[PDB]
Structure 1
């Protein structure tokens, strides 16, 4: 009734499926994903209680040495739905058919209930990420004619990659109240096109609903990629990037109590 994964005990890449009905198709998949840490003392552990539905991440890392300082952040511990295109991990037991071509997908709301506790000024964000690839089921990484979209609904001490492009308004719901929120749009080229939406009023805890197609429509419109609507929306990942090249100690704890994807009866891109 409790799933647990732990770094470094389970290796340098701990991860596990959440498959509550035991049917062999995970509803979500979790990864500790310390992708840019070469070595650290301490541990990071992610627990999911299958009765309460609470996902709890506890991280206490020190003596951090990065794989490549130019990649800036240290890792992105996360939970995701769909096909993560960097590896053979996937979760497709849900109402939205990911992966699917962006030209064929309906819009959906993404609602997350969570609480973030970075310790001692640790730079972090809480970001939702999607990869858009040329093939339907990619498992070996990302090419220069493909896109990452990120949506940061909390941050402290981290700036997205690239250059600011603009500000957009997006209607969201925060703690039960519909509100017009502002997101900065940032664009970079980092081996693939990266577009990040960073909220101007970070939300450290609570329940937030966002309309996914507002973000993907803007990422499509500012993209330099050809044939954007042929790309497949592989996944929806939710996690915390953390750290900078001068962070040597990273203590952080967070919780997620609910992720819901709600299909709408309208195209993703408008």
Structure 2
């Protein structure tokens, strides 16, 4: 069992897949109270009951992103050993991700259940900047909209509780220090099981960025990681009570 009760990263293995879990309070300057993240071989859980919160940088809006991930997270210059990522986007034929989740939170708290990747020009960057892309996939949100503005909608299939459905995904785009693309499901799901192919979101992102002056050759970027977690907070959030459980994780990367 892996148990963390303060910010940090631990590597673990879940049904043979090497992963990293990060009790990530990246934009919190100070807090009081409790946080706990645990992996027991079958499930990863997170719980927070924190108060006296203030952000390091209110311009970043959210306060943290407790998560787990497969691959190399640029910002932490970290990857567990044994991951098949990073690989160039062009080499990915398909990348299936499956997980079951159950999110709970006080009603007022800005929060999402979001997955993400970082597409970078070089294989092991320690930051993203102009020319790089962040792609997020939001399956749930509460009192939180993605950054930038909504530009498009895409119909992309996924399997929900074992049934193939067609989701309608809003695409939000922001041009910051790097390009931010967030796909947000229009019928959010707070608890369930999802399976989907990341290649559909890479394809949509490539089309959306086809006329970009900032992103040069999208298919030559490196797909570095797949992160799964919950962003939370806004610049006004002073306390946060929420938690989640993830189970039934599997992936199939075909390169």
* Cα distance between partner residues in 2 of 1:149 and 1:209: 17
Name 1:198's counterpart in structure 2. Answer: 184
Report how far residue 14 of structure 1 moved: 1.1
* Cα distance between partner residues in 2 of 1:168 and 1:41: 41
Name 2:78's counterpart in structure 1. Answer: 89
Name 2:38's counterpart in structure 1. Answer: 47
* Cα distance between partner residues in 1 of 2:160 and 2:93: 23
Report how far residue 259 of structure 1 moved: 1.8
Structural mapping, 1:67-146, within 5 Å: 67-93=56-82, 97-138=84-125, 140-146=126-132
Name 1:237's counterpart in structure 2. Answer: 227
Name 2:9's counterpart in structure 1. Answer: 15
Superposition TM-score, scaled by structure 2 size: 0.94
Report how far residue 44 of structure 1 moved: 1.2
- For the 8 Å contact 1:26–1:90, the answer to whether it is kept is no
The structure 1 residue matched to 2:19, chosen from 22, 28, 41, is: 28
Name 1:177's counterpart in structure 2. Answer: 163
- For the 8 Å contact 2:92–2:253, the answer to whether it is kept is no
The structure 1 residue matched to 2:241, chosen from 251, 261, 265, is: 251
**Cα distance, 1:64–1:98 mapped onto 2, change above 3 Å:** same
Report how far residue 145 of structure 1 moved: 1.0
- For the 8 Å contact 1:81–1:92, the answer to whether it is kept is no
**Cα distance, 1:113–1:93 mapped onto 2, change above 3 Å:** farther
- For the 8 Å contact 1:119–1:250, the answer to whether it is kept is yes
* Cα distance between partner residues in 1 of 2:228 and 2:81: 15
Name 2:55's counterpart in structure 1. Answer: 66
Give the match's secondary structure for 2:199. helix
Name 1:5's counterpart in structure 2. Answer: 4
Give the match's secondary structure for 1:216. helix
1:162-212 deviation digits (Å, cap 9, x = unpaired): 011111100111011101110000100121000000000001111101111
- For the 8 Å contact 2:109–2:232, the answer to whether it is kept is yes
Structure 2: give runs of 5+ residues left out of the alignment: none
Give the match's secondary structure for 1:144. coil
**Cα distance, 1:114–1:38 mapped onto 2, change above 3 Å:** same
Superposition TM-score, scaled by structure 1 size: 0.89
Report how far residue 89 of structure 1 moved: 2.0
Off by >2 Å, runs of 4+ in structure 1? 91-94
* Cα distance between partner residues in 2 of 1:111 and 1:19: 16
* Cα distance between partner residues in 1 of 2:13 and 2:229: 19
Instruction: Work out the number of aligned pairs and report it.
Output: 251
Name 2:208's counterpart in structure 1. Answer: 222
- For the 8 Å contact 1:38–1:66, the answer to whether it is kept is yes
* Cα distance between partner residues in 2 of 1:19 and 1:211: 22
**Cα distance, 1:165–1:92 mapped onto 2, change above 3 Å:** farther
1:63-94 deviation digits (Å, cap 9, x = unpaired): 10110111100011000000001113213535
